[PDB]
Amino acid sequence: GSELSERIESFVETLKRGGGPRSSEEMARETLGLLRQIITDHRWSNAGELMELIRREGRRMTAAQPSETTVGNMVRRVLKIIREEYGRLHGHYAQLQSNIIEAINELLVELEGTMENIAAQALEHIHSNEVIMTIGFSRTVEAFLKEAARKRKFHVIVAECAPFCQGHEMAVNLSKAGIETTVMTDAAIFAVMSRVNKVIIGTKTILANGALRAVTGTHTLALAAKHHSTPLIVCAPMFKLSPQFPNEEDSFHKFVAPEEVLPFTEGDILEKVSVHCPVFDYVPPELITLFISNIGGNAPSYIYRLMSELYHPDDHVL
Amino acid sequence: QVPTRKDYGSKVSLFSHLPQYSRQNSLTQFMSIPSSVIHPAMVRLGLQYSQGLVSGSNARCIALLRALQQVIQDYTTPPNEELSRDLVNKLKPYMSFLTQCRPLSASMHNAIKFLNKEITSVGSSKREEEAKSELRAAIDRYVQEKIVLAAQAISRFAYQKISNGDVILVYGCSSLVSRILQEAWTEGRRFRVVVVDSRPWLEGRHTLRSLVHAGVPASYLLIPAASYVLPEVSKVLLGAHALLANGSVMSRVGTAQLALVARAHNVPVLVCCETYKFCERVQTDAFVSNELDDPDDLQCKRGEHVALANWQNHASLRLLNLVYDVTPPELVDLVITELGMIPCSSVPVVLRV
Amino acid sequence: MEFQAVVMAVGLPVGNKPLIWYPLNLLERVGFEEVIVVTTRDVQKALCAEFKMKMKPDIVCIPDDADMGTADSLRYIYPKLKTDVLVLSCDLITDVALHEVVDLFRAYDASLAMLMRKRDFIGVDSTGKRLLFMANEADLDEELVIKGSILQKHPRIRFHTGLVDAHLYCLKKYIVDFLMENGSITSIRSELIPYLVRKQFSLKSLDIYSFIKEANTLNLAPYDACWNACRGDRWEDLSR
Amino acid sequence: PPLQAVLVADSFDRRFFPISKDQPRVLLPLANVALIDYTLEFLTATGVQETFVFCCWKAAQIKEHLLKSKWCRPTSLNVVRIITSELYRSLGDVLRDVDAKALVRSDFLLVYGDVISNINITRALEEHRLRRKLEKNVSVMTMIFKESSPSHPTRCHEDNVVVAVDSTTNRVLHFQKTQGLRRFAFPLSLFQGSSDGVEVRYDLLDCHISICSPQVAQLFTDNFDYQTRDDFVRGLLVNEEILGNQIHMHVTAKEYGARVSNLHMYSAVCADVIRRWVYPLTPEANFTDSTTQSCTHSRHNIYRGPEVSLGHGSILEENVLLGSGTVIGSNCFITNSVIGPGCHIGDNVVLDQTYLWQGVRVAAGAQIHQSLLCDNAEVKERVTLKPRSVLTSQVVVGPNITLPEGSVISLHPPDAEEDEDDGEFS
Structure with missing residues (x-):
């Protein structure tokens, strides 16, 4: 009712203004909790009416932050849950609602153990005295490496991101586990790529090509790893998989204020200059070797299948 | 004589052969205030190299050649000795000090090579100030033709x-x-x-x-x-x-x-x-x-x-x-x-x- | 030779050792094989013989006149100096490593480099090394004025009030040339500081630099700072 | 405590003339969005639970504009209180009205209605609450400034301020403007009263985000000649042995903040908004969720709305904004410009550093540089406007008529430099 409305707009203004909550799995949990609160606090007789309700609120929720696609594809998976259960109950008022709620709770209990399942398969991709390269900061790759470091000894070249150096966080989080990590700038990637054995990165959104948007500077990292033919590991969960094609819509990169690149104390050259700060970058699927998700390892020639196993083609435009 | 600059931090295992210094400490903390072993222009240049005030490759080469002009102008000849060996042997510890402040760019190495070849080709029958002016003119021609005129070209x-x-x-x-x-x-x-x-x-x-x-x-x-x-x-x-x-x-x-x-x-x-x-x-x-x-x-x-x-x-x-x-x-x-x-x-x- | 140290005496060797010996000891510690020392004649014009009784390596001690200033003291030895001048004073015992100030003279190619240790208001840039302004109300009728160009070129200027001059200078050749060509300057602490600070607000210009130490403090001509020299030397002279 | 804010939606300066004689300056759009929406977005993004809008001139228009906005919806987190009176005529009158009405509770935000900002003040508000708990209600106002070089086109010559602050406790000791003064005079009792360090600051752009206290309203009702903010801080800093009440300061170096006062600030702040210096407040984010303002962000900061219909040969190079429903002819050249919604642009025109509001109509062959075209205005063919040319509220210039550099023309005779007609003269 009114509480639900104020919860929806507090979430939508939180995504419009800044990063709330901090990491992406928390936001997926908030989106699933908000959607279960939506389907428990409304009235419907047909499933398509609830479909259009979820579509009408999710359109505003994706219009808040179009770079944050976790809310959008999480809403889209809830829509596919609605469509699957309506199809399995059509071939239906309270049993259908409680089945949707328990399937969403199933989705939460599979979604909560995502990083630990990715960490459990980390040991089959890391051998001892190996040089790993990481861009940015990500909790998935951090759990991956600090799980593989319980039995292996290797090296990690974590590279900072030039707009705001978030990978320094990962360095001080890795050196607490004893990884022998190495911090450098992203101007040295191709300078060091001749000795990096494997590149293990995270991402922000997996697209339907197998392509991915990620923190800026990772398309350069993918090009340098394609030049040196080193494999790429994308430690990504299965809620960063979105059906949005790369060149379809605009607003792909998230541009932020140019303060982080060029400060305001520069002078009157700010009025005659064009400063851009794209915090995201697009990596085509041909520069990617392997995806590591909670269900295992997959090729970039397989993501479309995960799309058809997780989304419906009528909900792509949402 | 001249100590080694202290290595800062934990070096990379892949870069163990390359030196890694710090801009916080200087090598001139334990050196004489009246510059006696190294010429004063060389210690001024090495200090303004280590602190990062001259960072361009042509600006570093220019400041090197100008400090070499100040050395050659402020040079004297020992008795019964030739310029073509003693001036080289005196400029070599200068370049060692410049290496210990900051490793030289290849512009500076080729400039040193040109100056060493030029100071080898100073005639024995020539006097002191005439050879000093010849070397100053050679250094001037080098900078002018190599950088300014090559830049215009x-x-x-x-x-x-x-x-x-x-x-x-x-x-x-x-x-x-x-x-x-x-x-x-x-x-x-x-x-x-x-x-x-x-x-x-x-x-x-x-x-x-x-x-x-x-x-x-x-x-x-x-x-x-x-x-x-x-x-x-x-x-x-x-x-x-x-x-x-x-x-x-x-x-x-x-x-x-x-x-x-x-x-x-x-x-x-x-x-x-x-x-x-x-x-x-x-x-x-x-x-x-x-x-x-x-x-x-x-x-x-x-x-x-x-x-x-x-x-x-x-x-x-x-x-x-x-x-x-x-x-x-x-x-x-x-x-x-x-x-x-x-x-x-x-x-x-x-x-x- | 890179530097020629000059110690001024314009109107005292009261302590555990000679008061001229501490500046000379500092000089003879780090280089300075030849030292130019100025003897006193304001109190008594017989101090040149008391200056030639020390045990330094080599001193050139000269007599001076009674009615004289620091600018006339440096202008008196102008035809006998050939390189940069490093000026000191008698009541100035400093445990600070001196090579910092010459580094500020060498690294930035300054025109004047000076050292202070905590009346006279000074304004120094946010870097903490290049000074920009200095004045006291002994010669200021109005409260305080700042040129606009130095605020456009240096937007934040940290001011200090309790800082006192340690009288450890590092002048170049053309500054002392201007001092000998301009005999209107009498106190170099109030003439060569303020006139060069005004001339630094000019591209091609001169550089003025300062080092603020925090280990000890200098002395005064009066008996206000005559009590701390022995207290400094009882705990600082064991290493010296 | 809930965070309150007082918004003065009527700048009592005579600057936007005759721009302001039709709509008040708070309804003036930067890029299709009025300034009151920017200010309310800043207040709602900082976390203000209740504001007090104080509108004096053309206040019914502000009431009809602001009631249909996002901040008067019952679903809005930031509740507004539109308070209008035809009696008060200055900012001191607003705050003495605040003290008479007893509106605020604890540490409100005094701000004008035409400030563009994205400053998160909760750290500065935490610092202010710490100082109020330490000094026992001695610190009164916390002025928010932004680090900026004096060469920036944002800070102009009429609003450059120089401050003198004790940098260890971050309190303001002296405050003065630089209008018509090449030299700056600082008193000397500042150094003798506090010998723990002192610093002068010329790098401070005034954001006018002064966090205040109920003691501010007490001081405004206690002294009648305090007309505005600078009068308050100048009377508080010269009087220490009476009414001690020291003023503190906060400086932001990572967030944007500036207010408009004349055309110069308007142009600089609009160029900063188009160049995304005030992210998240960007014209594609649609912080005021109006369906007639949504845009698409292309390369080179080109913002395009819906149903724009660019002509063939029209070149938009960088920092262009087009509202919803504008149409642009062929072989055009538009750069550094803001075009309102529903305009009509002819053929082979050059629009550089211009600001076209809603409903304009540009004929073919026109050359407009650094101008301001207000609502429903239009230029005929073979016209070229010089830089800093303002025409307002359904003006029309004659064809084959070039205006001078200093050119403000409107329908009002005595407030503008000319009068609007079909021809350039009479």
Whole structure:
């Protein structure tokens, strides 16, 4: 009712203004909790009416932050849950609602153990005295490496991101586990790529090509790893998989204020200059070797299948 | 005599042969205030090298040659001894001190080679002040012809390359590319320049001012954003610090990165290097010969937390900020020298003879 | 030779050792094989013989006149100095490593480089090394005025009030040339400081630099600072 | 405590004339969005639970504009209180009205209605609450400034301020403007009263985000000649042995903040908004969720709305904004410009650093540089406007008529430099 409305707009203004909550799995949990609160606090007789309700609120929720696609594809998976259960109950008022709620709770209990399942398969991709390269900061790759470091000894070249150096966080989080990590700038990637054995990165959104948007500077990292033919590991969960094609819509990169690149104390050259700060970058699927998700390892020639196993083609435009 | 500068931090296991110093401490803390072993111009130059006040490769070579002029003007001849051996033997510890302050760019090595060859070719029948003036004139001719006149020649050879309406990408700060762009804007070409900069030097801001004060439309961004702008770039100009024997291009660390991303976008690369920066040294990767700057320079203040403030307390943490890297010559299309526009793979053939 | 140290005496060897010996000891510690020392004649014009009784390696002690200033003291030895001048004073015992100030003279190629240790208001740039302004109300009628060009070129200027001059200078050749060509300056602490600070607000210009130490403090001509020299020398002279 | 804010939606300066004689300056659009929406977005993004809008001139229009906005919806987190009176005529009158009405509770935000900002003040508000708990209600006002070089086109010559602050406790000791003064005079009792360090600051751009206290309203009702903010801080800093009440300061170096006062600030702040210096407040984010303002962000900061219909040969190079429903002819050249919604542009026109509001109509062959075209205005063919040319509220210039550099023309005779007609003269 009114509480639900104020919860929806507090979430939508939180995504419009800044990063709330901090990491992406928390936001997926908030989106699933908000959607279960939506389907428990409304009235419907047909499933398509609830479909259009979820579509009408999710359109505003994706219009808040179009770079944050976790809310959008999480809403889209809830829509596919609605469509699957309506199809399995059509071939239906309270049993259908409680089945949707328990399937969403199933989705939460599979979604909560995502990083630990990715960490459990980390040991089959890391051998001892190996040089790993990481861009940015990500909790998935951090759990991956600090799980593989319980039995292996290797090296990690974590590279900072030039707009705001978030990978320094990962360095001080890795050196607490004893990884022998190495911090450098992203101007040295191709300078060091001749000795990096494997590149293990995270991402922000997996697209339907197998392509991915990620923190800026990772398309350069993918090009340098394609030049040196080193494999790429994308430690990504299965809620960063979105059906949005790369060149379809605009607003792909998230541009932020140019303060982080060029400060305001520069002078009157700010009025005659064009400063851009794209915090995201697009990596085509041909520069990617392997995806590591909670269900295992997959090729970039397989993501479309995960799309058809997780989304419906009528909900792509949402 | 002259001690060794102390190694700072935990060195990289791959870079164990290369020295890694710090800008916090100086070598001149334990040296005499009246400069007696090293000439005072040499200790002034080494201090302003170690602190980073002169960072350009041509500015470092110029300050080296000017300090050598101050040494040669303030030189005296010992009894029954020749200039052509003692002056070399006195300038060699000077270059050792300059190496211990900061490793020399290949411009400085070739300048030392030219000065050593010139001071060997001083006649024995010539007097003191006549040979001193001859050496001063030779050093003056060297700087004038090698950099100033080669720069004008490179500017003329690059003006017939820059067209109207195109976009040009530059990286870092180098007086040669900035002079090329300025004299192309003044001579009539109307273009816009993007500028890629990188941490922690952020020296591209310098060339940004140089293009805004010259009236050039400019765009400023960092290295990771280069993949975003190379779709707009039609030409990438680069400033080389050394050209190697195999045709590789030694420059700042983002040079090879930018060349790879530019080739991925089908963007022709153009290096501009003067022929005195030609090295007989040859290398195939960015690992066997490079300079390591301060690892405590990589830290920055993003809010109220500096992640790398106490980075030395973490024993398993290593910090490295390379200054130079090399590009393979199959990434570079032009090499614009004062001898002309040559390809990259033909550079040691024409440079040698 | 890079430097020629000059110690001024314009109107005292009261302590555990000679008061001229501490500046000379500092000089003879780090280089300075030849030292130019000025003897006193304001109190008594017989001090040149008391200056030639020390045990330094080599001193050139000269007599001076009674009615004289620091600018006339440096202008008196102008045809006998050939390189940069490093000026000191008698009541100035400093445990600070001196090579910092010459580094500020060498690294930036300064025109004047000076050292202070905590009346006279000074304004120094946010870097902490290059000074920009200095004045006291002994010669200021109005409260305080700042040129606009130095605020456009230096937007934040940290001011200090309790800082006192340690009288350890590092002058170049052309500054002392201007001092000998301009005999209107009498106190170099108030003439060469303020006139060069005004002339530094000019591109091609001169550089003025300062080092603020925090280990000890200098003395005064009066008996206000005559009590701390022995207290400094009882705990600082064991290493010396 | 809930965070309150007092918004003065009527700048009592005579600056936007005759721009302001039709709509008040708070309804003036930067890029299709009025300034009151920017200010309310800043207040709602900082976390203000209740504001007090104080509108004096053309206040019914502000009431009809602001009631249909996002901040008067019952679903809005930031409740507004539109308070209008035809009696008060200055900012001191607003705050003495605040003290008479007893609106605020604890540490409100005094701000004007035409400030563009994205400053998160909760750290500065934490600092202010710490100082109020330490000094026992001695610190009164916390002025928010932004680090900026004096060469920036944002800070102009009429509003450049120089401050003198004790940098260890971050309190303001002296405050004065630089209007018509090449030299700056600082008193000397500042150094003798506090010998723990002192610093002068010329790098401070005034954001006018002064965090205040109920003691501010007490001081405004206690002294009648305090007309505005600078009068308050100048009377508080010269009087220390009576009414001690020291003023503190906060400086932001990572967030944007500036207010408009004349055309110069308007142009600089609009160029900063178009160049995304005030992210998240960007014209594609649609912080005021109006369906007639949504845009698409292309390369080179080109913002395009829906149903724009660019002509063939029209070149938009950088920092262009087009509202919803504008149409642009062929072989055009538009840069550094803001075009309102529903305009009509002719053929072979050059629009550089211009600001076209809603409903304009540009004929073919026109050259407009650094101008301001207000609502429903139009230019005929063969016209070229010089830089800093303002025409307002359904003006029309004659064809083959070039205006001078200093050119403000409107329908009002005595407030503008000319009068609007079909021809350029009479």
